[PDB]
Ligand binder design. Structure first.
Ligand SMILES: CC(=O)N[C@H]1[C@H]([C@H](O)[C@H](O)CO)O[C@@](OC[C@H]2O[C@@H](O[C@H]3[C@H](O)[C@@H](O)[C@H](O)O[C@@H]3CO)[C@H](O)[C@@H](O)[C@H]2O)(C(=O)O)C[C@@H]1O
Ligand SMILES: CC(=O)N[C@H]1[C@H]([C@H](O)[C@H](O)CO)O[C@@](OC[C@H]2O[C@@H](O[C@H]3[C@H](O)[C@@H](O)[C@H](O)O[C@@H]3CO)[C@H](O)[C@@H](O)[C@H]2O)(C(=O)O)C[C@@H]1O
Lengths: 194, 189
Protein backbone atom coordinates (compact mmCIF):
# COMPACT_ATOMS: atom_id res chain seq x y z
CA UNK A 1 0.00 0.00 0.00
CA UNK A 2 2.91 2.46 0.41
CA UNK A 3 2.53 3.95 -3.07
CA UNK A 4 -1.21 3.34 -3.62
CA UNK A 5 -3.26 6.50 -3.79
CA UNK A 6 -6.99 7.10 -3.86
CA UNK A 7 -8.53 8.94 -6.78
CA UNK A 8 -11.18 10.50 -4.52
CA UNK A 9 -11.28 10.81 -0.70
CA UNK A 10 -13.41 12.58 1.91
CA UNK A 11 -13.43 12.51 5.67
CA UNK A 12 -15.68 13.73 8.50
CA UNK A 13 -18.86 14.47 6.55
CA UNK A 14 -22.19 14.74 8.37
CA UNK A 15 -25.28 14.18 6.26
CA UNK A 16 -28.89 14.51 7.33
CA UNK A 17 -31.51 12.22 5.77
CA UNK A 18 -32.41 13.33 2.29
CA UNK A 19 -29.68 15.92 1.94
CA UNK A 20 -26.85 13.83 0.49
CA UNK A 21 -23.40 15.36 -0.11
CA UNK A 22 -22.39 16.16 -3.70
CA UNK A 23 -18.94 15.05 -4.84
CA UNK A 24 -19.52 15.77 -8.55
CA UNK A 25 -17.25 18.82 -8.61
CA UNK A 26 -14.42 17.30 -6.61
CA UNK A 27 -11.03 16.70 -8.20
CA UNK A 28 -11.09 13.01 -9.09
CA UNK A 29 -14.83 12.81 -9.74
CA UNK A 30 -14.23 12.41 -13.52
CA UNK A 31 -12.08 9.41 -12.85
CA UNK A 32 -14.69 7.87 -10.54
CA UNK A 33 -17.40 8.44 -13.22
CA UNK A 34 -15.28 6.37 -15.66
CA UNK A 35 -14.10 3.47 -13.54
CA UNK A 36 -13.67 0.19 -15.38
CA UNK A 37 -12.70 -1.54 -12.10
CA UNK A 38 -11.54 -0.42 -8.67
CA UNK A 39 -12.11 -0.34 -4.92
CA UNK A 40 -14.37 1.64 -2.58
CA UNK A 41 -13.76 1.72 1.21
CA UNK A 42 -16.16 3.57 3.55
CA UNK A 43 -16.28 3.98 7.32
CA UNK A 44 -19.57 5.43 8.61
CA UNK A 45 -22.01 5.78 11.47
CA UNK A 46 -25.70 5.71 10.60
CA UNK A 47 -28.32 7.50 12.66
CA UNK A 48 -31.14 6.60 10.30
CA UNK A 49 -33.82 3.88 10.26
CA UNK A 50 -34.27 4.36 6.52
CA UNK A 51 -34.46 0.93 4.89
CA UNK A 52 -31.88 1.58 2.09
CA UNK A 53 -29.08 4.09 2.68
CA UNK A 54 -26.60 4.73 -0.09
CA UNK A 55 -23.12 5.49 1.26
CA UNK A 56 -21.69 6.38 -2.17
CA UNK A 57 -23.34 6.52 -5.56
CA UNK A 58 -22.33 7.34 -9.11
CA UNK A 59 -24.94 7.65 -11.84
CA UNK A 60 -27.20 9.50 -14.22
CA UNK A 61 -29.47 11.85 -12.29
CA UNK A 62 -31.56 13.09 -15.22
CA UNK A 63 -35.24 12.57 -15.93
CA UNK A 64 -36.05 9.13 -17.32
CA UNK A 65 -32.64 7.71 -16.32
CA UNK A 66 -33.48 6.67 -12.76
CA UNK A 67 -32.31 3.06 -13.34
CA UNK A 68 -28.84 4.13 -14.47
CA UNK A 69 -26.54 4.20 -11.42
CA UNK A 70 -24.19 2.38 -9.08
CA UNK A 71 -24.43 2.53 -5.30
CA UNK A 72 -22.93 0.88 -2.23
CA UNK A 73 -25.57 0.85 0.53
CA UNK A 74 -26.46 -0.31 4.02
CA UNK A 75 -29.84 -1.17 5.49
CA UNK A 76 -31.77 -0.70 8.68
CA UNK A 77 -31.67 -4.46 9.26
CA UNK A 78 -27.84 -4.52 9.34
CA UNK A 79 -27.44 -5.45 5.69
CA UNK A 80 -24.80 -4.31 3.19
CA UNK A 81 -25.30 -4.32 -0.54
CA UNK A 82 -24.61 -2.82 -3.93
CA UNK A 83 -26.48 -2.30 -7.14
CA UNK A 84 -24.92 -1.72 -10.54
CA UNK A 85 -27.57 -0.70 -13.06
CA UNK A 86 -28.08 0.62 -16.58
CA UNK A 87 -31.78 -0.19 -16.89
CA UNK A 88 -32.80 -3.83 -16.42
CA UNK A 89 -32.73 -4.51 -20.18
CA UNK A 90 -28.98 -3.80 -20.10
CA UNK A 91 -27.82 -4.98 -16.65
CA UNK A 92 -28.85 -5.18 -13.02
CA UNK A 93 -26.05 -6.68 -10.88
CA UNK A 94 -26.65 -6.71 -7.17
CA UNK A 95 -25.47 -7.97 -3.83
CA UNK A 96 -27.33 -7.97 -0.53
CA UNK A 97 -25.78 -9.52 2.60
CA UNK A 98 -27.62 -9.86 5.89
CA UNK A 99 -26.38 -9.25 9.40
CA UNK A 100 -23.10 -7.73 8.29
CA UNK A 101 -23.15 -4.26 9.99
CA UNK A 102 -24.68 -2.76 13.14
CA UNK A 103 -26.47 0.51 13.76
CA UNK A 104 -25.73 0.63 17.46
CA UNK A 105 -23.61 -0.81 20.25
CA UNK A 106 -24.19 0.06 23.94
CA UNK A 107 -26.66 2.83 23.14
CA UNK A 108 -24.17 4.52 20.83
CA UNK A 109 -24.14 4.73 17.04
CA UNK A 110 -21.24 2.45 16.11
CA UNK A 111 -18.70 2.86 13.35
CA UNK A 112 -18.70 0.25 10.61
CA UNK A 113 -16.37 -0.12 7.62
CA UNK A 114 -17.45 -1.65 4.33
CA UNK A 115 -15.75 -2.12 0.96
CA UNK A 116 -16.55 -3.16 -2.58
CA UNK A 117 -14.09 -4.09 -5.26
CA UNK A 118 -14.70 -4.78 -8.92
CA UNK A 119 -11.99 -6.64 -10.84
CA UNK A 120 -12.19 -6.67 -14.63
CA UNK A 121 -9.47 -9.31 -15.08
CA UNK A 122 -11.57 -12.05 -13.42
CA UNK A 123 -15.00 -10.46 -13.91
CA UNK A 124 -15.60 -10.44 -10.17
CA UNK A 125 -17.13 -8.22 -7.50
CA UNK A 126 -16.38 -8.66 -3.76
CA UNK A 127 -18.10 -7.12 -0.79
CA UNK A 128 -16.51 -6.76 2.69
CA UNK A 129 -17.77 -5.54 6.02
CA UNK A 130 -16.07 -5.23 9.40
CA UNK A 131 -13.15 -7.52 8.64
CA UNK A 132 -15.00 -10.18 6.64
CA UNK A 133 -15.44 -11.07 2.98
CA UNK A 134 -19.21 -11.38 2.86
CA UNK A 135 -20.03 -12.04 -0.83
CA UNK A 136 -18.46 -12.67 -4.20
CA UNK A 137 -20.19 -12.27 -7.59
CA UNK A 138 -18.81 -13.35 -10.98
CA UNK A 139 -20.62 -12.23 -14.18
CA UNK A 140 -19.86 -13.41 -17.68
CA UNK A 141 -20.88 -10.01 -19.00
CA UNK A 142 -18.72 -7.92 -16.62
CA UNK A 143 -19.75 -4.30 -16.16
CA UNK A 144 -18.71 -1.33 -14.08
CA UNK A 145 -19.25 2.41 -13.84
CA UNK A 146 -17.95 3.20 -17.35
CA UNK A 147 -20.80 1.03 -18.73
CA UNK A 148 -23.54 3.17 -17.20
CA UNK A 149 -25.04 5.56 -19.73
CA UNK A 150 -24.91 9.33 -19.12
CA UNK A 151 -23.20 9.49 -15.73
CA UNK A 152 -23.36 13.04 -14.41
CA UNK A 153 -22.92 12.89 -10.64
CA UNK A 154 -21.06 11.34 -7.74
CA UNK A 155 -22.46 11.69 -4.22
CA UNK A 156 -22.41 10.53 -0.68
CA UNK A 157 -25.47 9.56 1.31
CA UNK A 158 -28.00 8.92 -1.47
CA UNK A 159 -28.48 8.20 -5.16
CA UNK A 160 -29.74 10.87 -7.59
CA UNK A 161 -32.85 9.69 -9.42
CA UNK A 162 -34.55 12.26 -11.65
CA UNK A 163 -33.17 15.08 -9.51
CA UNK A 164 -34.35 13.54 -6.19
CA UNK A 165 -32.09 12.11 -3.45
CA UNK A 166 -33.10 8.46 -3.26
CA UNK A 167 -31.95 5.83 -0.75
CA UNK A 168 -31.18 8.47 1.84
CA UNK A 169 -28.50 8.07 4.51
CA UNK A 170 -28.31 9.97 7.78
CA UNK A 171 -25.31 10.14 10.08
CA UNK A 172 -21.59 10.56 9.36
CA UNK A 173 -19.35 9.42 6.53
CA UNK A 174 -16.18 9.15 8.61
CA UNK A 175 -13.85 8.19 5.75
CA UNK A 176 -14.53 7.43 2.12
CA UNK A 177 -11.86 6.40 -0.42
CA UNK A 178 -12.21 5.36 -4.06
CA UNK A 179 -9.30 3.70 -5.88
CA UNK A 180 -8.78 2.75 -9.52
CA UNK A 181 -6.58 -0.03 -8.10
CA UNK A 182 -8.05 -3.39 -7.14
CA UNK A 183 -6.97 -3.86 -3.52
CA UNK A 184 -6.22 -7.34 -2.22
CA UNK A 185 -8.61 -9.26 -0.01
CA UNK A 186 -5.98 -9.20 2.75
CA UNK A 187 -5.79 -5.41 2.54
CA UNK A 188 -9.59 -5.08 2.61
CA UNK A 189 -9.96 -7.51 5.53
CA UNK A 190 -7.38 -5.41 7.45
CA UNK A 191 -8.80 -1.99 6.65
CA UNK A 192 -12.45 -2.94 7.15
CA UNK A 193 -11.70 -4.78 10.41
CA UNK A 194 -9.82 -1.99 12.11
CA UNK B 1 -31.36 -39.56 -9.96
CA UNK B 2 -33.70 -36.61 -9.92
CA UNK B 3 -36.06 -36.09 -6.99
CA UNK B 4 -38.69 -34.49 -9.21
CA UNK B 5 -39.05 -34.50 -13.00
CA UNK B 6 -41.72 -33.41 -15.51
CA UNK B 7 -41.86 -33.24 -19.28
CA UNK B 8 -44.04 -31.53 -21.88
CA UNK B 9 -46.00 -29.23 -19.59
CA UNK B 10 -47.78 -26.53 -21.51
CA UNK B 11 -48.92 -23.52 -19.48
CA UNK B 12 -51.39 -20.78 -20.39
CA UNK B 13 -49.96 -17.43 -19.43
CA UNK B 14 -51.11 -16.63 -15.91
CA UNK B 15 -52.29 -20.09 -14.78
CA UNK B 16 -49.08 -21.80 -13.70
CA UNK B 17 -48.92 -25.56 -13.11
CA UNK B 18 -49.01 -26.82 -9.55
CA UNK B 19 -46.48 -29.46 -8.55
CA UNK B 20 -47.26 -29.23 -4.84
CA UNK B 21 -48.97 -32.63 -4.76
CA UNK B 22 -46.41 -34.52 -6.90
CA UNK B 23 -44.31 -37.30 -5.41
CA UNK B 24 -40.95 -35.65 -4.60
CA UNK B 25 -42.49 -32.25 -3.87
CA UNK B 26 -41.80 -32.60 -0.13
CA UNK B 27 -38.14 -33.17 -0.82
CA UNK B 28 -37.99 -30.14 -3.11
CA UNK B 29 -39.69 -28.03 -0.42
CA UNK B 30 -36.84 -28.91 1.96
CA UNK B 31 -33.75 -28.70 -0.25
CA UNK B 32 -30.55 -27.68 1.53
CA UNK B 33 -28.70 -27.65 -1.81
CA UNK B 34 -29.22 -29.09 -5.27
CA UNK B 35 -29.52 -28.61 -9.01
CA UNK B 36 -32.39 -27.50 -11.23
CA UNK B 37 -32.30 -28.04 -15.04
CA UNK B 38 -35.09 -26.74 -17.25
CA UNK B 39 -35.63 -26.74 -21.01
CA UNK B 40 -38.43 -24.44 -22.09
CA UNK B 41 -40.05 -22.46 -24.84
CA UNK B 42 -41.72 -19.22 -23.88
CA UNK B 43 -44.64 -17.96 -25.96
CA UNK B 44 -45.21 -14.93 -23.67
CA UNK B 45 -44.00 -11.33 -23.65
CA UNK B 46 -44.50 -11.14 -19.90
CA UNK B 47 -41.58 -9.26 -18.35
CA UNK B 48 -40.70 -11.78 -15.61
CA UNK B 49 -41.59 -15.46 -16.04
CA UNK B 50 -40.86 -17.95 -13.31
CA UNK B 51 -39.96 -21.38 -14.71
CA UNK B 52 -39.97 -23.11 -11.33
CA UNK B 53 -40.72 -21.75 -7.86
CA UNK B 54 -40.86 -23.11 -4.34
CA UNK B 55 -42.23 -20.94 -1.53
CA UNK B 56 -44.77 -19.78 0.99
CA UNK B 57 -48.02 -18.82 -0.77
CA UNK B 58 -49.90 -17.58 2.32
CA UNK B 59 -51.05 -14.08 3.14
CA UNK B 60 -48.30 -11.77 4.42
CA UNK B 61 -45.57 -14.13 3.17
CA UNK B 62 -45.17 -12.84 -0.36
CA UNK B 63 -41.41 -12.27 0.06
CA UNK B 64 -40.75 -15.87 1.15
CA UNK B 65 -39.91 -17.95 -1.95
CA UNK B 66 -37.33 -19.19 -4.41
CA UNK B 67 -37.70 -18.96 -8.18
CA UNK B 68 -35.68 -19.49 -11.33
CA UNK B 69 -36.96 -17.11 -14.01
CA UNK B 70 -36.49 -15.68 -17.49
CA UNK B 71 -37.35 -12.27 -18.85
CA UNK B 72 -38.80 -10.85 -22.04
CA UNK B 73 -35.42 -9.10 -22.64
CA UNK B 74 -33.59 -12.46 -22.85
CA UNK B 75 -32.46 -12.40 -19.24
CA UNK B 76 -32.13 -15.34 -16.85
CA UNK B 77 -32.16 -14.98 -13.08
CA UNK B 78 -33.07 -16.38 -9.73
CA UNK B 79 -34.24 -15.02 -6.39
CA UNK B 80 -33.93 -16.72 -3.03
CA UNK B 81 -35.93 -14.82 -0.45
CA UNK B 82 -37.19 -15.01 3.15
CA UNK B 83 -38.13 -11.34 3.51
CA UNK B 84 -35.38 -8.81 2.96
CA UNK B 85 -34.53 -8.62 6.68
CA UNK B 86 -33.55 -12.29 6.55
CA UNK B 87 -32.10 -12.76 3.05
CA UNK B 88 -32.51 -11.71 -0.56
CA UNK B 89 -29.97 -13.51 -2.76
CA UNK B 90 -30.35 -12.90 -6.47
CA UNK B 91 -28.83 -13.30 -9.89
CA UNK B 92 -29.83 -11.54 -13.07
CA UNK B 93 -27.93 -12.09 -16.33
CA UNK B 94 -28.62 -10.19 -19.52
CA UNK B 95 -28.78 -11.52 -23.08
CA UNK B 96 -28.47 -15.18 -22.02
CA UNK B 97 -31.60 -16.73 -23.65
CA UNK B 98 -33.77 -15.98 -26.66
CA UNK B 99 -37.52 -15.23 -26.45
CA UNK B 100 -37.88 -15.45 -30.17
CA UNK B 101 -35.49 -15.42 -32.96
CA UNK B 102 -36.27 -15.55 -36.67
CA UNK B 103 -39.83 -14.48 -35.87
CA UNK B 104 -40.24 -17.86 -34.16
CA UNK B 105 -40.32 -19.05 -30.56
CA UNK B 106 -37.28 -21.18 -29.67
CA UNK B 107 -36.11 -23.67 -27.04
CA UNK B 108 -33.58 -22.77 -24.33
CA UNK B 109 -32.10 -24.73 -21.45
CA UNK B 110 -31.11 -23.14 -18.14
CA UNK B 111 -29.79 -24.50 -14.87
CA UNK B 112 -29.09 -23.37 -11.34
CA UNK B 113 -27.08 -25.15 -8.71
CA UNK B 114 -26.81 -24.34 -5.04
CA UNK B 115 -23.76 -25.90 -3.33
CA UNK B 116 -23.83 -25.84 0.44
CA UNK B 117 -20.22 -26.83 1.10
CA UNK B 118 -18.84 -24.23 -1.25
CA UNK B 119 -21.54 -21.70 -0.27
CA UNK B 120 -22.03 -21.09 -3.98
CA UNK B 121 -24.78 -20.62 -6.57
CA UNK B 122 -24.06 -21.03 -10.27
CA UNK B 123 -26.36 -20.13 -13.16
CA UNK B 124 -26.08 -21.64 -16.65
CA UNK B 125 -27.88 -21.03 -19.94
CA UNK B 126 -27.48 -22.60 -23.34
CA UNK B 127 -24.08 -24.15 -22.73
CA UNK B 128 -22.54 -21.25 -20.86
CA UNK B 129 -21.83 -20.49 -17.19
CA UNK B 130 -23.31 -17.01 -16.88
CA UNK B 131 -22.88 -16.08 -13.18
CA UNK B 132 -21.60 -17.32 -9.83
CA UNK B 133 -22.59 -16.01 -6.39
CA UNK B 134 -20.76 -16.94 -3.17
CA UNK B 135 -22.44 -15.87 0.13
CA UNK B 136 -20.84 -16.11 3.53
CA UNK B 137 -24.23 -16.84 4.98
CA UNK B 138 -25.34 -19.61 2.63
CA UNK B 139 -29.11 -20.26 2.36
CA UNK B 140 -31.41 -22.44 0.35
CA UNK B 141 -35.00 -23.64 0.25
CA UNK B 142 -34.93 -25.22 3.74
CA UNK B 143 -34.17 -21.74 5.16
CA UNK B 144 -37.39 -20.21 3.75
CA UNK B 145 -40.09 -19.93 6.40
CA UNK B 146 -43.37 -21.77 5.81
CA UNK B 147 -42.84 -23.32 2.39
CA UNK B 148 -46.14 -24.83 1.19
CA UNK B 149 -46.02 -25.04 -2.58
CA UNK B 150 -43.99 -25.93 -5.66
CA UNK B 151 -45.07 -24.58 -9.09
CA UNK B 152 -44.06 -24.38 -12.70
CA UNK B 153 -44.67 -21.20 -14.60
CA UNK B 154 -45.16 -18.69 -11.75
CA UNK B 155 -44.60 -17.97 -8.06
CA UNK B 156 -47.41 -18.08 -5.47
CA UNK B 157 -47.67 -14.77 -3.60
CA UNK B 158 -50.64 -14.46 -1.22
CA UNK B 159 -52.61 -16.88 -3.36
CA UNK B 160 -51.91 -15.14 -6.68
CA UNK B 161 -49.73 -16.52 -9.51
CA UNK B 162 -46.98 -13.93 -9.79
CA UNK B 163 -44.29 -13.76 -12.49
CA UNK B 164 -46.46 -15.70 -14.96
CA UNK B 165 -44.91 -17.85 -17.73
CA UNK B 166 -46.65 -18.91 -20.93
CA UNK B 167 -45.34 -21.64 -23.20
CA UNK B 168 -43.95 -25.11 -22.64
CA UNK B 169 -41.77 -26.52 -19.91
CA UNK B 170 -40.23 -29.14 -22.16
CA UNK B 171 -38.21 -30.82 -19.43
CA UNK B 172 -37.68 -30.02 -15.77
CA UNK B 173 -35.45 -31.95 -13.35
CA UNK B 174 -34.60 -31.22 -9.74
CA UNK B 175 -31.73 -33.00 -8.00
CA UNK B 176 -30.65 -33.03 -4.34
CA UNK B 177 -27.14 -33.61 -5.79
CA UNK B 178 -24.83 -30.78 -6.90
CA UNK B 179 -23.89 -31.39 -10.53
CA UNK B 180 -20.46 -30.34 -11.78
CA UNK B 181 -19.92 -27.29 -13.93
CA UNK B 182 -18.85 -29.53 -16.82
CA UNK B 183 -22.07 -31.57 -16.47
CA UNK B 184 -24.15 -28.36 -16.49
CA UNK B 185 -22.39 -26.93 -19.54
CA UNK B 186 -23.21 -30.19 -21.31
CA UNK B 187 -26.84 -30.57 -20.18
CA UNK B 188 -27.71 -26.94 -20.98
CA UNK B 189 -26.34 -27.28 -24.56
C1 LIG C 1 -31.81 -1.70 -3.05
C2 LIG C 1 -33.18 -1.93 -3.62
O1 LIG C 1 -34.00 -2.68 -3.08
N1 LIG C 1 -33.47 -1.25 -4.69
C3 LIG C 1 -34.70 -1.48 -5.46
C4 LIG C 1 -35.74 -0.37 -5.21
C5 LIG C 1 -36.23 -0.22 -3.78
O2 LIG C 1 -36.67 -1.47 -3.27
C6 LIG C 1 -37.37 0.79 -3.69
O3 LIG C 1 -37.09 1.99 -4.45
C7 LIG C 1 -37.61 1.16 -2.24
O4 LIG C 1 -38.84 1.86 -2.10
O5 LIG C 1 -36.91 -0.65 -6.01
C8 LIG C 1 -36.70 -0.62 -7.42
O6 LIG C 1 -37.93 -1.05 -7.99
C9 LIG C 1 -39.10 -0.24 -7.73
C10 LIG C 1 -39.56 0.41 -9.01
O7 LIG C 1 -39.92 -0.62 -9.96
C11 LIG C 1 -40.25 -0.05 -11.20
O8 LIG C 1 -40.57 -1.10 -12.09
C12 LIG C 1 -39.43 -1.81 -12.57
C13 LIG C 1 -39.83 -3.29 -12.55
O9 LIG C 1 -40.02 -3.78 -11.21
C14 LIG C 1 -38.71 -4.09 -13.21
O10 LIG C 1 -39.15 -5.46 -13.25
C15 LIG C 1 -38.46 -3.57 -14.63
O11 LIG C 1 -37.36 -4.26 -15.20
O12 LIG C 1 -38.04 -2.22 -14.47
C16 LIG C 1 -39.14 -1.42 -14.02
C17 LIG C 1 -38.71 0.05 -14.16
O13 LIG C 1 -37.68 0.40 -13.22
C18 LIG C 1 -41.49 0.83 -11.06
O14 LIG C 1 -41.78 1.44 -12.32
C19 LIG C 1 -41.24 1.94 -10.04
O15 LIG C 1 -42.41 2.70 -9.83
C20 LIG C 1 -40.76 1.32 -8.74
O16 LIG C 1 -41.78 0.51 -8.15
C21 LIG C 1 -36.39 0.79 -7.90
O17 LIG C 1 -35.83 0.96 -9.02
O18 LIG C 1 -36.73 1.76 -7.17
C22 LIG C 1 -35.63 -1.66 -7.80
C23 LIG C 1 -34.38 -1.47 -6.96
O19 LIG C 1 -33.54 -2.59 -7.27
C1 LIG D 1 -37.36 -10.51 -10.42
C2 LIG D 1 -37.77 -9.19 -9.82
O1 LIG D 1 -37.56 -8.12 -10.37
N1 LIG D 1 -38.43 -9.22 -8.68
C3 LIG D 1 -38.74 -8.02 -7.92
C4 LIG D 1 -40.21 -7.63 -8.10
C5 LIG D 1 -40.60 -7.26 -9.55
O2 LIG D 1 -39.70 -6.25 -10.06
C6 LIG D 1 -42.02 -6.66 -9.60
O3 LIG D 1 -42.91 -7.45 -8.82
C7 LIG D 1 -42.53 -6.65 -11.02
O4 LIG D 1 -43.73 -5.87 -11.06
O5 LIG D 1 -40.46 -6.43 -7.28
C8 LIG D 1 -40.34 -6.65 -5.88
O6 LIG D 1 -40.48 -5.39 -5.25
C9 LIG D 1 -41.75 -4.74 -5.49
C10 LIG D 1 -42.49 -4.62 -4.16
O7 LIG D 1 -41.71 -3.83 -3.26
C11 LIG D 1 -42.34 -3.69 -2.00
O8 LIG D 1 -41.50 -3.12 -1.05
C12 LIG D 1 -40.30 -3.77 -0.63
C13 LIG D 1 -39.20 -2.72 -0.66
O9 LIG D 1 -38.94 -2.32 -2.02
C14 LIG D 1 -37.95 -3.33 -0.06
O10 LIG D 1 -36.95 -2.33 -0.04
C15 LIG D 1 -38.23 -3.86 1.32
O11 LIG D 1 -37.11 -4.51 1.91
O12 LIG D 1 -39.26 -4.83 1.23
C16 LIG D 1 -40.50 -4.25 0.80
C17 LIG D 1 -41.61 -5.30 0.95
O13 LIG D 1 -41.48 -6.36 0.01
C18 LIG D 1 -43.76 -3.19 -2.01
O14 LIG D 1 -44.32 -3.27 -0.69
C19 LIG D 1 -44.61 -3.93 -3.04
O15 LIG D 1 -45.84 -3.19 -3.18
C20 LIG D 1 -43.87 -4.02 -4.37
O16 LIG D 1 -43.68 -2.72 -4.93
C21 LIG D 1 -41.43 -7.59 -5.37
O17 LIG D 1 -41.28 -8.16 -4.26
O18 LIG D 1 -42.47 -7.74 -6.07
C22 LIG D 1 -38.93 -7.12 -5.58
C23 LIG D 1 -38.54 -8.32 -6.44
O19 LIG D 1 -37.15 -8.55 -6.16
Amino acid sequence: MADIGSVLQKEGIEISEGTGYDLSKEPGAATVKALEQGTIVISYKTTSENAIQSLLSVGNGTKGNQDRHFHLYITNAGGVGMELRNTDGEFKYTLDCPAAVRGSYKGERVSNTVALKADKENKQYKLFANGELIATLDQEAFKFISDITGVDNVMLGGTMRQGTVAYPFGGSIERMQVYRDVLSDDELIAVTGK
